[PDB]
Structure formats: structure tokens, C-alpha cells
């Protein structure tokens, strides 16, 4: 119930949100349908509309008027945004040359630059280019300012996910607004873009940024806006909060504009009918601009013009329905569209299977537009598992496709062009990114970043500490003018072992063996050096990775490759080697092929046995550097060590071999040699997050040597490939994968070929950033390079996307 007969007079478009059951005056009360009785007349005010024209100048102010025109307007703060430029004899602001802005020039009583977001729904990223001759404002802003040429989304790319996103820093999973609709299991509830439900704060987790500048102080715009608040009040609001006295004016204020995704959902990207929805986002910018210049604002405020997501072309005749796969299809619920998410429909019911389910709907059809998975399965990059709100069973979709339950659904729940919410790396799905202002850096364009990291920067420039968050704290340093965070390396918490020979043969009991008893001063003096660390630099090009848990492990050095040796979980957490263009593949010799070796630096105890992957008849093993890239056939011993050895299904071996045998080796060719870090990672509660030894379910057959969940390789080269990878003096190039450790290759549907038909595109997919594998390894890379740490940052959040240009 809302008592509505009390009165917005004096109270338009307040900060502070009123407790029912009084009525409200803010630019919320609209959705809420809890406006006072006088809200529109008081405070939606249209006479005249949004312009001055010569007549009304020097005009006798009239208060019924939408904007004014009168003389007292800039005073009173209430002018319209072209007042200036009709009555005055002044320029719109795009017209003006663009000059650097060097320091803040902002009126007296401003304590920092003010921070204005103005975010465009389904803004895809070509529209900077495509749309250029209709966007002047946006084009001046873009050419003026810090720009990206892209911006990457979350997933999925959706508006309520990515928006949330954008404030919080956060990923879907960890904010909890995981779609733009989801059912929430435990409030045995919906949310959905219409509707109340959505405004229940029980749904929305994090700290968005309004929230970290309330409790530092600093005082922040309304974010949301009530859709029938028109988009020239929506400005003229903040250009009216922007002349309150100093001790009650926001410093940080939000924009939001459905366009062009409303139109673009109904015509396509780049339909006819999508020129006029740029023209008006622009003109709105232009307002705002001309709105500033007017205020003294324009080179004192940080503007950062951002989107959500892009737009891709969908039309109902590609949608892909579960009813031609399943059976059973009336038992179970989807979450349709650009994206499937599958649960049981009788909640509790004990016989809805969800392995014959994903078994329907792999393969089944040579065409099939969609992907099921377990959503432990889902790239690692997604980052979309640990939720409750996500369903187990996720349907990855084409792009360009929908998936529906059944026909009835999309013939009776085409009036539709457009679509998105398709995997973040889909180029239609790329939004945008420009920040202009004294803060920003001139002229400047940076790489395409995530928008995950903008939180941190948002906070930068507010003075604000941020809330914990997935951004990397540093990686956009280089967009700024003046930076306040000045990040540095997290420090080292268990220092390595060096263990020398320590162990005879016959001390170990392993049921390993191999034929390695075919045996001179020069070449004895020579392998004791190599075990010493002499071929280091060679094969540990950017320092030893430091390892940021409590731990105990051991640094083992070889001819060919280095490594931390786990005592705990009994295998490498990581193992490092260099790969000329120049070296050369061999085969493992016939008389090895089944070689193990003790490794007399290492404790029978700490070891593992080849007992184990005899008697377990579903795990086989494989090893982390490649005896197929030895440097020489007596090199080649070392790569048999138990210490080199790890859990791997036959099925995954395929994958493994393949990887080692042939794409390393490739890679080196191309990229003119690279540095290879290979390991496990343990993540069997998908939370993105390194497994400690108690969360471990799975283990090899009677023993204690825990199963990988996926195994990292991190493969870095010189950015400058006219330099090899072990002499560059500049910055480098990283591209790296987290591949699931499945024991089938179902993911793969032309997996029965060879592996050269199929191995590359599911590496393709589950790329990864080095942050990744750092979070799920409690592993810090790069620790000694000649590059500056804001630089990798960046390198360590780069994700190589595998998308054409
Ligand atoms: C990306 O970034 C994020 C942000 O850094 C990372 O997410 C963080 O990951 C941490 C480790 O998993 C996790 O720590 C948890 O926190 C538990 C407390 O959780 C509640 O409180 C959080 C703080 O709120 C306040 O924040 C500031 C201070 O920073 C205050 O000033 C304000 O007043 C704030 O209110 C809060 O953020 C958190 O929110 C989640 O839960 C809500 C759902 O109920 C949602 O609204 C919201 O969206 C969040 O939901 C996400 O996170 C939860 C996990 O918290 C997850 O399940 C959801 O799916 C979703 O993803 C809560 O409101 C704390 O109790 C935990 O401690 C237990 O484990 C540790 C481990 O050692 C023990 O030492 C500890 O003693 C304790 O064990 C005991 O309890 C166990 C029961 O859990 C029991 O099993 C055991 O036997 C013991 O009795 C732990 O520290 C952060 O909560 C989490 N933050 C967020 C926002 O998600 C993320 O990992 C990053 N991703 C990657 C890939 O890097
Ligand atoms: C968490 C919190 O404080 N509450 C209280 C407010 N409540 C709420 C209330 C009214 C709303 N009315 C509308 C029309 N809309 C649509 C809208 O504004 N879209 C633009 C937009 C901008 C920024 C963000 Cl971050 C997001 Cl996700 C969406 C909302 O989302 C909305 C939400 C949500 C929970
Ligand atoms: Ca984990
Ligand atoms: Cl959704
Ligand atoms: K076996
Ligand atoms: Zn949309």
C-alpha cells in the first residue's frame, strides 16, 4: 500500500528514497508504481519540449516549461542544453577542436572530477565504425579520448548480467545475476526483467559501485532509471544534480539508454531502421556534452561511454527445439533462447536423469546448433558454474541460433531480427569502451579488455577502495593520465626445496620399470651441472612461478625442463620448457614405451607408483614435458621420471599426445620459438578457485595421487616474433588453455578422426587468460621479467579469442 496523496513540490527527482507507505519523488518511483499524485505534473514537465529556439531567448521564466530559456536559467541550473548555443552565441561542444585536457578544470567547491557512466544497451562494437557518419558526438568523444576498438562482455551476454557486471566488478556467478531470468531454488522463485521480483535485494550480491562510494563517502546518482522516463530528462536530471550545493551533489552519476538494443532486437544489427536509433543515442550524448560545456563542466568531468553487449542476427527459423531429441521432453524446464539451461520440472523428483539428458542431445544431429554440458564442463573462461541459480545441464548455442523446448513455444509464448547472450568471444557480441576526461589519457587507444575490470578503475577514479573483486587491479593502469593504485606483485608464501640425490634405486618399491641400464668424465660432469640449474635460463624464462599457499614442494632442474614437485599432491604443480623454432620432434624409442623411472631426488614416500595405473583400468598417465621434444636421446631418460608423470584417461591422452606431438611444435615454427608451462589444476567444486588436498574426489585406484580436473599450458613468445622466444628484449605474447580432463571425448563430436581434425578446435575454446590459471592454481607467473608490472597485468588478463578480424 502506498499513502500517495502527499506531494513531490520541491522534492523532483530526490536522492534519498522515502519508506513507505509514503509516496516518492525519485526517478525509481515509476517502476515501482509508488509516485506521488503529483509526480508528473511537478516533476515530468514537457512544455515547449527539449530545445531553445531564438524566440524564447532572455525569455520571462515560466515553470510549467520543460527546460528554460530565461535569463536566471544557468543560475538556477534548469536551462536546456542548447541555451547557450541559440541565445548566447556559443558552439555545441562537437564542433569545438579537441584539446587536450591536461588537469581538471572544474568550478570551486569541486573535491575530484565528477564520474558520469553513460551506458547504451546492445551496442555492438562495429557500430563505432559502421555507424560513424551519424554518431559526431560519439566519434569526438572516441577519437578524443581512451578508446578500445572492443570491449568483452560477460556470459552470458545479457543485459542484467553485464550491467551488474559492469558495478560490481564481478562475475555473474559471484553477483547473482546470472540471466536475464533465473529461477532461484532455495526462495523457490523467478526473476525476470519484468516484473517486482527483480527489485528484492535479496537477488543482488556484491557491492556495486554506487554502494562503495556511499561508505566511503562519496555520494552516487541513482543507477537504474524508470523506463518511462524520458532519455532528455533523464539528462537534464543530472545536469540539475550537478548544481546542487557541494555538500549534497553526487560526484558519480549513471546514464542508462535502452537503445539501440530495443530496435536492434526487432531489425537486426545493421537493419535500415537501425540509422535513427544511433542518430538519438548521439544527439543524447550531445546534450549532455553541451549540458556540461554550459556548467563549466566539459574538462572537468570522467565520462566513460560503455555497453553491455552486442547484437547478433536471430530469426525464428534457427531456432533448435528439444522435442525433435527428447522424448521425455515434457519433464523437464528451459531456460530458452541464446543460451539453454535445463532442470527438472517436479522439483525433488528423484528419477529425472540428467546424464540421459546430455546424452539425448550430444551429437544427434550432423548440423546440431547447440552444445550440452555439464556446467562444470563449460570453459573455464565462462567462469559461469558456482551458483546455485545455474542450472546443472547448459546448452552452449551457436550464434546466429536459438534453442527452444518445443514449437508451440516460439509459434504461440517472426517478431524478431535481432538476439543476443551467445559465448563473451562471439565478435557480434563485442561491445564498446571510451572514457574521456582530465583523467583519461589524449588521443590514446589500448588493447580490448574485459569489462570485468572496469570496477577498479571506476573506484580509481573516484578515490575509492574497491570491494573485492575479479578485475586485476592494475591491468588498466594504461588508460590512465594519473593513476592512484600502483599495484605490485603478491609476495611468495612457501619457499621451494632444492633437493639433491638423496636415494638409492633399490629404496624404492614403485612396480615401475624401464630399460635404461645402457651405460665417461666429459659428459658426467656435464649432466651434474644440468641437475644443478646450469640450462635454467634456457627453460625458465621469466622466473619461477611463486607459489602463494602453504605448501611443500621442490624445485627439479634438467637438461630439458624444470619443475615444482608437489610433496602433497605428488605431481608438478608446474613444469617449464623452452622450444626452439629450430628443434626437432623424435618418437619415444620402442625399448621405452612404457618407461618409468624413480627419481632419486624424491622420497619413495612422496613418489608415485606405477602399481596404481595398472590395477585402476580407467586411468592411464601422460607427462607434463613431452619426451617427443627431448634435446637428445640421453635428455630423453629424464622425461620418464615419476616426478614428470601425471593422471591421464586414455581418452584425454588423444588430446594430450596430440598437443605435445604435434602443436608445440607448430607453435614454436610460427611464433619463432616458445617458453611451454604445463600442470595440473584441481577444481572439483568449479568455483574457479584452487582445490585444497581435502576437497580432492577423486584419486588413482588405491592410492593417494589425486586426479587432475584439467590440465594449464601458459605459451609465451616474443611480441617481436623477428626475435626467438629466448632472447626477447620487449614485450611478449602469451596465449594459454585449461583443457578438462574428461575420459571421454563426447565434448568433440568428430572426435573418431584424427586427432588433427579435432584436438585444435577444443583447445580453441578452452582458452584461457593467465589469471585464470593463476586463480585456479595459487600460482603467480612472470615474476621476473624486464617488463613493467602494469604491463603484465595486462599480458596475464589477455585472452587469445581464436575470432576473425
Ligand atoms: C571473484 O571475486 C569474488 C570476490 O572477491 C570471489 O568471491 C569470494 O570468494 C571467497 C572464497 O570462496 C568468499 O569468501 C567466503 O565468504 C563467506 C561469507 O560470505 C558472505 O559474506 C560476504 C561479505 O559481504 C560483505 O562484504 C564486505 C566485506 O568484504 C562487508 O563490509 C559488507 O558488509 C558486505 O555485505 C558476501 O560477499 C557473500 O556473498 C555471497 O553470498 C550471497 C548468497 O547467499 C550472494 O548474495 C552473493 O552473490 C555471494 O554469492 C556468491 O558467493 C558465495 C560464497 O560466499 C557462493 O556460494 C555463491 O554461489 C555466489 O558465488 C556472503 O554474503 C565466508 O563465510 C566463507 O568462509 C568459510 O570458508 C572459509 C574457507 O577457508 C573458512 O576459513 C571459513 O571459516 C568458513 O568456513 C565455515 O563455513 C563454511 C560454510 O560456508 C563451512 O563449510 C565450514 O565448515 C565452516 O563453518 C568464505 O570466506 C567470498 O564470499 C566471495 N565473495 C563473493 C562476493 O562472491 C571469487 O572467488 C572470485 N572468482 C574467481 C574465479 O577468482
Ligand atoms: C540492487 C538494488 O539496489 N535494487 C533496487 C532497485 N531494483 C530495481 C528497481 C527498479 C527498476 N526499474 C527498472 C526499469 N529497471 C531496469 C533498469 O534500470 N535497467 C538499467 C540498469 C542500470 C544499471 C544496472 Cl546495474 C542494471 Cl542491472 C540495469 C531495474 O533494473 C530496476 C531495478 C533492483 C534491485
Ligand atoms: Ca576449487
Ligand atoms: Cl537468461
Ligand atoms: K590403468
Ligand atoms: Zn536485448
Not at 287 to 306: P, S, Y
Not at 546 to 559: G, P
Not at 680 to 693: A, H, M, Q, S, W
Request: proline residues 7%.
Amino acid at each position: 500500500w502506498t499513502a500517495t496523496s502527499g506531494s513531490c513540490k520541491g522534492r523532483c527527482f530526490e536522492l534519498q528514497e522515502v519508506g513507505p507507505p509514503d509516496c516518492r519523488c525519485d526517478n525509481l518511483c515509476k517502476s515501482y508504481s509508488s509516485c506521488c499524485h503529483d509526480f508528473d505534473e511537478l516533476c515530468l514537465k514537457t512544455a515547449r519540449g527539449w530545445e531553445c529556439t531564438k524566440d524564447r531567448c532572455g525569455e520571462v521564466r515560466n515553470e510549467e516549461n520543460a527546460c528554460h530559456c530565461s535569463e536566471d536559467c544557468l543560475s538556477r541550473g534548469d536551462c536546456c542544453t542548447n541555451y547557450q548555443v541559440v541565445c548566447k552565441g556559443e558552439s555545441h561542444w562537437v564542433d569545438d577542436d579537441c584539446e587536450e585536457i591536461k588537469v581538471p578544470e572544474c568550478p570551486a567547491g569541486f573535491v575530484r572530477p565528477p564520474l558520469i557512466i553513460f551506458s547504451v544497451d546492445g551496442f555492438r562494437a562495429s557500430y563505432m565504425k559502421k555507424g560513424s557518419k551519424v554518431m559526431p558526438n560519439i566519434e569526438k568523444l572516441r577519437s578524443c579520448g581512451t578508446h578500445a576498438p572492443y570491449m568483452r562482455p560477460v556470459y552470458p551476454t545479457k543485459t542484467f548480467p553485464n550491467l551488474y557486471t559492469l558495478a560490481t566488478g564481478l562475475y555473474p556467478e559471484s553477483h547473482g545475476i546470472v540471466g536475464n531470468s533465473m529461477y532461484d531454488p532455495v526462495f523457490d522463485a523467478s526473476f525476470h526483467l519484468r516484473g517486482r521480483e527483480k527489485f528484492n535485494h535479496r537477488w543482488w550480491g556484491g557491492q556495486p559501485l554506487w554502494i562503495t562510494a556511499t561508505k566511503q563517502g562519496v555520494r552516487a546518482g541513482t543507477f537504474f532509471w524508470s523506463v518511462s522516463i524520458p532519455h532528455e530528462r533523464r539528462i537534464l536530471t543530472i545536469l540539475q544534480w550537478l548544481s546542487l550545493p557541494d555538500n549534497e551533489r553526487p560526484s558519480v552519476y549513471a546514464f542508462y539508454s535502452e537503445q539501440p538494443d530495443f530496435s536492434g532486437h526487432k531489425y537486426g544489427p545493421f537493419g535500415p531502421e537501425m540509422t535513427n536509433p544511433l542518430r538519438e543515442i548521439d544527439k543524447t550524448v550531445g546534450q549532455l556534452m553541451d549540458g556540461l560545456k554550459q556548467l563549466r563542466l566539459h574538462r572537468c568531468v570522467n565520462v566513460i561511454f560503455v555497453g553491455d553487449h552486442g547484437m547478433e542476427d536471430v530469426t525464428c527459423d534457427r531456432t533448435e527445439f528439444l522435442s525433435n531429441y527428447l522424448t521425455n521432453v515434457d519433464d523437464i524446464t528451459l531456460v530458452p533462447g541464446t543460451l539453454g539451461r535445463i532442470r527438472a520440472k517436479s522439483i525433488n523428483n528423484s528419477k529425472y536423469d540428467p546424464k540421459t539428458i546430455i546424452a539425448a542431445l550430444t551429437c544427434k544431429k550432423p548440423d546440431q546448433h547447440f552444445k550440452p554440458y555439464m556446467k562444470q564442463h563449460l570453459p573455464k573462461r565462462l567462469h559461469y558454474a558456482n551458483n546455485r541459480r545455474i542450472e546443472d545441464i547448459h546448452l552452449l548455442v551457436d550464434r546466429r541460433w536459438h534453442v527452444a523446448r518445443k514449437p508451440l513455444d516460439v509459434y504461440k509464448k517472426c517478431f524478431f531480427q535481432g538476439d543476443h547472450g551467445f559465448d563473451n568471444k562471439v565478435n557480434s557480441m563485442q561491445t564498446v569502451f571510451v572514457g574521456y576526461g582530465p583523467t583519461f589519457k589524449y588521443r590514446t587507444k589500448v588493447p580490448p579488455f574485459e569489462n570485468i575490470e572496469l570496477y577498479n578503475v571506476m573506484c580509481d577514479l573516484l578515490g575509492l577502495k574497491p570491494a573485492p573483486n575479479n578485475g586485476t587491479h592494475g591491468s588498466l593502469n594504461h588508460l590512465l593520465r594519473t593513476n592512484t593504485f600502483r599495484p605490485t606483485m603478491p609476495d611468495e608464501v612457501s619457499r621451494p626445496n632444492y633437493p639433491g640425490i638423496m636415494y638409492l634405486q633399490s629404496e624404492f618399491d614403485l612396480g615401475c620399470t624401464c630399460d635404461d641400464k645402457v651405460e665417461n668424465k666429459l659428459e658426467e660432469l656435464n649432466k651434474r651441472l644440468h641437475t644443478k640449474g646450469s640450462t635454467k635460463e634456457r627453460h625458465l624464462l621469466y622466473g619461477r612461478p611463486a607459489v602463494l599457499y602453504r605448501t611443500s614442494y621442490d624445485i627439479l632442474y634438467h637438461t630439458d625442463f624444470e619443475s615444482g614437485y608437489s610433496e602433497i599432491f605428488l605431481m608438478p604443480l608446474w613444469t617449464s620448457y623452452t622450444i626452439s623454432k629450430q628443434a626437432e620432434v623424435s618418437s619415444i624409442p620402442e625399448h621405452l614405451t612404457n618407461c618409468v623411472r624413480p627419481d632419486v631426488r624424491v622420497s619413495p614416500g612422496f613418489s608415485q607408483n606405477c602399481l596404481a595405473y595398472k590395477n585402476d583400468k580407467q586411468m592411464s598417465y601422460g607427462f607434463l614435458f613431452p619426451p617427443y621434444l627431448s634435446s637428445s636421446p640421453e635428455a630423453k631418460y629424464d622425461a620418464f621420471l615419476v616426478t614428470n608423470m601425471v593422471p591421464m584417461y586414455p581418452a584425454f591422452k588423444r588430446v594430450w599426445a596430440y598437443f605435445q606431438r604435434v602443436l608445440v611444435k607448430k607453435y614454436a615454427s610460427e611464433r619463432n620459438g616458445v617458453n611451454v608451462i604445463s600442470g595440473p589444476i584441481f577444481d572439483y567444486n568449479y568455483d574457479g578457485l584452487r582445490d585444497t588436498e581435502d576437497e580432492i574426489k577423486q584419486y588413482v585406484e588405491g592410492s593417494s595421487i589425486p586426479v587432475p580436473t584439467h590440465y594449464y599450458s601458459i605459451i609465451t613468445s616474443c611480441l617481436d616474433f623477428t626475435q626467438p622466444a629466448d632472447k626477447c628484449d620487449g614485450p611478449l605474447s602469451v596465449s594459454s588453455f585449461i583443457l578438462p580432463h574428461r575420459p571421454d571425448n563426447d565434448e568433440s563430436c568428430n572426435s573418431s578422426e584424427d586427432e588433427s581434425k579435432w584436438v585444435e578446435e577444443l583447445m580453441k575454446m578452452h582458452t584461457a587468460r593467465v589469471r585464470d590459471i593463476e586463480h585456479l592454481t595459487g600460482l603467480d607467473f612472470y615474476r621476473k621479467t624486464s617488463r613493467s608490472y602494469s604491463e603484465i597485468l595486462t599480458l596475464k588478463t589477455y585472452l587469445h579469442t581464436y575470432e576473425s578480424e
